[PDB]
């Protein structure tokens, strides 16, 4: 049964570190296996580096190639013995997500699988120590929160950057859309992956910026200049695998050439990309030019920038984004003479924690923005949905139009990830931001005679700048974060549409723990995205401040008939989280450009001026509770 | 919570002006106010006039009667739409002040609710004009102080007379001690309201006199003789609700009868009240006499003079 299948998968995931020791007399028998096994076990696996990605791709293909699920388990079991463990988790998760046979199946928790990445060195150590200190079945609980002097204000952001859910999501997203993805081999293609790459990262930056403003900090600045020295960050993460940890980065070092790539080349790829934007075309390998069409342009750019296998030209355009992670990651030892491990930037699970991440991503976002700039703005025609008027919006909470945010304690179970020994469970307690539940009530007047179908789009943007209160829509575009997108039908006359925050399309409703999965539930059975992907729920709104920071609440309704695509896909599957994740094996459900209406330049000085009749702005307050 | 309650009250107070227009598919839907709200906005609401006060009292009672706070809001939602707005503010404020359910709750600012009463028409016009002149989110600031050929020395007193705080206080005081107040209905009684009526007004006069002297002006003289013409005063206040303003009064007017009351009926009352003072007793409706006791006397007089519902006759 599916349940049995789930059980088999969980053990593929257990004791990965330990699983090493090949115990294989000869790989030759495993002809399938010949391609992989270059990267050594203990070594850190880089999600960004090309060579690492190549190995990973080779692994996935074997998994995809597996004739049946049983065969899948077998090769996996054997492969896991030799290959580097990180690569293994990566390859398997991709396989589980896509391979039909796996119509059954969650992947074990990333946080749970590698607890060391989620929690600090100290609380790893304490738990391990307590386990040894007194042998006893009794459970061990450790509170990760610590005590220390906070000299850097960046620390304030830690609730966002360090959040477990955020890191997990980032890991999962890359799994759903792998850079290595080869559509020919799989046969299936990931719709608009390049564009999604752009959108997801942009949102992370946008959301990040809202945190800084909530904090009273200015917006992050892009890492435009390669010459400038980076701010330091020390992760305090250990790797349980070997005797090492992610190397910390002290303050003020500029980027240095690696054997693999010169910083020169980084500059060059990015000049090349800029040219191709303006010249309005990119050059394919064939030396043909493909236009940066309005429809296609973002996607093509996304593939080139990341860059994915899909890039029209790798040899010219290179892989700017990925190399950036690699270069930043080994700033400490570009030479690798030190034989020190890379920093957090190397891993999709960890990278969000470093503040540098935002600087780089804003830089890349800028590239996309220049492209967007080339496009013409939106006419009333494009925006408006005639006959529909938005009367008002209200947010209901304990206090209307105010959302309250607080910190909540939570526990993570280490036992699946690290050797438990005698103890039944070792849990680490951490705290994260959370907010009260709320609902939206939108009153819409349907002037038309017949029932209409509308897509409701809701975004949140900060009211205040760093200077004073200034709702300049051009700037707002960067800041706006997507709260929700959903379909509703309106009858003629007045209508009130109520939606609850829980329903939000952006967030993951729930991630099942390896324990829940040990039994067998019925959300349904799809895969790595299952409970994993989606933005985390606690994270839905920015922290705000004790004072109650003012944010613009924007609701827009668009013609659904226009917005939806027609086609024939599946049952109700992982679609909760469509806004950032997309739909399983389906085309992106919205015709509009991701981020619409915000994606293109706004002529108006004030946001209010921008509004059409099917748009509305309600100012609400977010107040944090200490 | 209380905070939520406060929020609900503030909107009862917003746009008193605009929340007229029945907005009621069957306009019988607040039958309790088919009777009350016999004032449509046309003239202004008078705090002094008896008929107006009667309507106001009727309104308050309904508000007091409201079973719970939610019911209270509902009355105040649906009812506001019909009744004259001034009466409405008056009735609601009284309700908020006394009704327990409202153990929560300030009333929105009078100055803030009706800015037009506090500031001059010119400033109000300018602000409104600036709003229209250039649409922009930007804030508008207008300095009310003006520039003017001050002939009258009375102008000197304007700092006192025109003061926003003073006017607001006077509004509020009448709310705490309404003339209409019926102790039986509420059940509770306002201690020494008649005396307080006397004391508060006396203080206002006394304080006023100190201003004149500070000014170098002589003390104010009473309106002892009804025949004498009044000094004129032009308020320069507009009412935002419609086209009109408080009518100014030019110099030198002798006294005219109104349909409602003859100034002679008035003169009688003064004789009567003062008679009873000397005679040391007043006559009740029952035709019994109540003594103007040292303890009680001021209070009884206050009720009769104002006069409140409490007046013995």
From Swiss-Prot, chain A:
Compartments, as annotated in UniProt: Secreted, Extracellular space
Protein name (database record): Hemocyanin AA6 chain
UniProt keyword list: Copper, Disulfide bond, Metal-binding, Oxygen transport, Phosphoprotein, Secreted, Transport
More about this protein: The two copper ions bound each have 3 nitrogen ligands (presumably contributed by His residues) and share a bridging ligand (possibly contributed by a Tyr residue) in addition to binding oxygen.
Phosphoserine carried by residues: 374
Keyword Phosphoprotein attributed: yes
Post-translational modification: Three disulfide bonds are present.
Binding annotation for Cu cation 2: 321, 325, 361
Assembly and oligomerization: Scorpion hemocyanin is a 24-chain polymer with 8 different chains identified, assembled in hexameric substructures.
Family membership: Belongs to the tyrosinase family. Hemocyanin subfamily.
Gene Ontology molecular functions: chloride ion binding; copper ion binding; oxidoreductase activity; oxygen carrier activity
Assigned GO CC terms: extracellular region
Main location: secreted
Coiled coil: none
Residues that bind Cu cation 1: 170, 174, 201
Tissue expression notes: Hemolymph.
Organism: Androctonus australis
Function text: Hemocyanins are copper-containing oxygen carriers occurring freely dissolved in the hemolymph of many mollusks and arthropods.
């Amino acid at each position: 049964t599916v349940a049995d299948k789930q059980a088999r998968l969980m053990p593929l995931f257990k004791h990965l570190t330990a699983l090493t020791r090949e115990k294989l007399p000869l790989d030759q028998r495993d002809e399938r296996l010949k391609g992989v096994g270059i990267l050594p076990r203990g070594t850190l696996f880089s999600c960004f580096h090309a060579r690492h990605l190549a190995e990973a791709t080779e692994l996935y293909v074997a998994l995809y190639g597996a004739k049946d699920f049983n065969d899948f388990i077998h090769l996996c079991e054997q492969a896991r013995q030799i290959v580097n463990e990180g690569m293994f988790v990566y390859a398997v998760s991709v396989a589980v997500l896509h391979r039909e046979d796996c119509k059954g199946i969650t992947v074990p928790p990333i946080q749970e699988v590698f607890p060391d990445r989620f929690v600090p060195a100290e609380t790893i150590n304490r738990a391990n120590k307590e386990a040894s200190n007194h042998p006893d079945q009794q459970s061990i609980v450790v509170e990760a929160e610590e005590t220390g002097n906070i000299l850097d204000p960046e620390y304030k952001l830690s609730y966002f950057r360090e959040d477990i859910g955020i890191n997990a999501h980032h890991w999962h997203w890359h799994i759903v859309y792998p850079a290595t993805w080869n559509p020919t081999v799989m046969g299936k293609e990931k719709d608009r992956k390049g564009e999604l790459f752009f959108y997801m990262h942009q949102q992370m930056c946008a959301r990040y910026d809202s945190e800084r403003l909530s904090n009273g900090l200015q917006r992050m600045i892009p890492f435009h200049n390669f010459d400038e020295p980076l701010e330091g960050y020390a992760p305090h993460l250990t790797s349980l695998v070997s005797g090492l940890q992610y190397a910390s980065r002290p303050e003020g070092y500029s980027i240095h050439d690696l054997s693999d790539v010169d910083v020169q080349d980084m500059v060059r790829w990015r000049e090349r990309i800029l040219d191709a934007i303006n010249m309005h075309y990119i050059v394919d390998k064939d030396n043909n030019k493909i236009p940066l069409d309005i429809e296609h342009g973002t996607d093509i750019l996304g593939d080139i920038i990341e860059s994915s296998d899909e890039s029209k030209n790798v040899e010219y355009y290179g892989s700017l984004h990925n190399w950036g992670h690699v270069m930043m990651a080994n700033i400490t030892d570009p030479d690798h003479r030190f034989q020190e491990n890379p920093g957090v930037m190397s891993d999709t699970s960890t990278s969000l924690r470093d503040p540098i991440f935002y600087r780089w991503h804003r830089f890349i976002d800028n590239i996309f923005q220049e492209h967007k700039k080339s496009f013409h703005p939106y006419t009333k025609e494009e925006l408006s949905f005639p006959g529909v008027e938005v009367v008002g919006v209200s947010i209901n909470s304990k206090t209307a139009n105010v959302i309250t945010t607080l910190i909540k304690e939570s526990l993570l179970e280490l036992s699946h990830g690290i050797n438990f020994g005698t103890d039944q469970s070792v849990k680490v307690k951490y705290h994260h931001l959370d907010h009260e539940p709320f609902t939206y009530n939108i009153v819409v007047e349907n002037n038309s005679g017949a029932e209409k179908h509308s897509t409701v789009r809701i975004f949140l943007a900060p009211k205040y700048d760093e200077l004073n209160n200034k709702l300049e829509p051009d700037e707002q575009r960067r800041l706006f974060i997507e709260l929700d997108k959903f379909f509703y039908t309106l009858t003629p006359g007045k209508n009130t549409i109520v939606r609850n925050h829980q329903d939000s399309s952006v967030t993951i409703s729930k991630v099942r723990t390896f324990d829940q999965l040990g039994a067998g539930e019925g959300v349904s059975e799809d895969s790595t995205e299952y409970c994993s992907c989606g933005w985390p729920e606690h994270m839905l709104i920015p922290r705000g401040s004790h004072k109650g920071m003012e944010f613009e609440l924007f609701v827009m309704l668009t013609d659904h008939d226009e917005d939806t695509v027609a086609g024939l896909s599946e049952n109700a599957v992982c679609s909760d989280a469509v806004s950032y994740c997309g739909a399983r094996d389906d085309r992106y459900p919205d015709k509009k450009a991701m981020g619409f209406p915000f994606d293109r330049k706004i002529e108006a000085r004030t946001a209010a001026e921008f509004l059409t009749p099917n748009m509305g702005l309600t100012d609400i307050k977010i107040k944090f509770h200490g």
